[PDB]
Amino acid sequence: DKTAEYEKYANYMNYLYYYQNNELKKIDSSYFKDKYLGLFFGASWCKYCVTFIDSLNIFKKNFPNVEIIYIPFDRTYQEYQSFLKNTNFYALPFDNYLYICKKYQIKNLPSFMLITPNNNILVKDAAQLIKTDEYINNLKSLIKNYIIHPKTFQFNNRFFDLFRN
Numbered sequence: 001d002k003t004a005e006y007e008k009y010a011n012y013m014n015y016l017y018y019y020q021n022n023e024l025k026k027i028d029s030s031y032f033k034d035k036y037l038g039l040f041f042g043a044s045w046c047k048y049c050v051t052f053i054d055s056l057n058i059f060k061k062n063f064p065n066v067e068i069i070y071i072p073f074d075r076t077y078q079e080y081q082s083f084l085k086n087t088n089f090y091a092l093p094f095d096n097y098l099y100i101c102k103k104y105q106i107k108n109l110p111s112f113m114l115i116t117p118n119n120n121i122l123v124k125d126a127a128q129l130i131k132t133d134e135y136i137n138n139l140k141s142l143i144k145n146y147i148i149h150p151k152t153f154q155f156n157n158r159f160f161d162l163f164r165n
Contacts (some may be wrong), residue, residue, distance in 0.1 A: 006155075009164075010155040010160075013029055013163065015093070016092065019085045024081070029159055031110055036065060037114070038066050038069065038113070038115075039071055039114075040089065040110065040111075041110060042071070044074050044080070045074070046110060049109055052112075053087055055131055066143075069091065070091035070093060071091075073109065100153075100163050103165075104124075106142065113125075116153040117120060118149060122142065122143070123139075
């Protein structure tokens with residue numbers, strides 16, 4: 001039965017999650033339409049993923065417009081919650097996301113990818129980019145100059161196109 005399947009696709013990733021004063025919260029995925037995204041692949045058991053949070057906090061200070069989304073590879077839901085409570089990032093719901101790794105040929109954790117509003121890759125290896133403080137003005141210029149050609153996504157669902165295509 002196709003309708004059952006395709007309804008799930010149209011409704012794929014309808015919410016992202018975050019913590020706030022130790023309260024699990026959610027936000028409708030439509031908020032992220034037309035926004036630059038920072039996709040952070042990480043896990044609480046990954047030593048340098050935890051240290052990388054310091055670089056991401058500096059990044060967010062300087063690029064508050066770019067929405068950071070945690071793609072989790074935690075071992076347990078309990079670790080996932082603890083990691084979200086400590087970073088206050090948005091996150092995909094706790095689940096298996098190896099398929100996103102395969103699509104983008106992600107080889108190591110942590111990884112950080114910068115995504116344009118029309119789902120193009122602005123910077124593939126942004127984890128390396130942001131590890132010094134020296135990247136800030138060139139990235140302001142790159143974002144300011146980027147010409148966004150409109151794109152229609154399958155089911156008008158931006159995350160389906162980004163993660164499942």
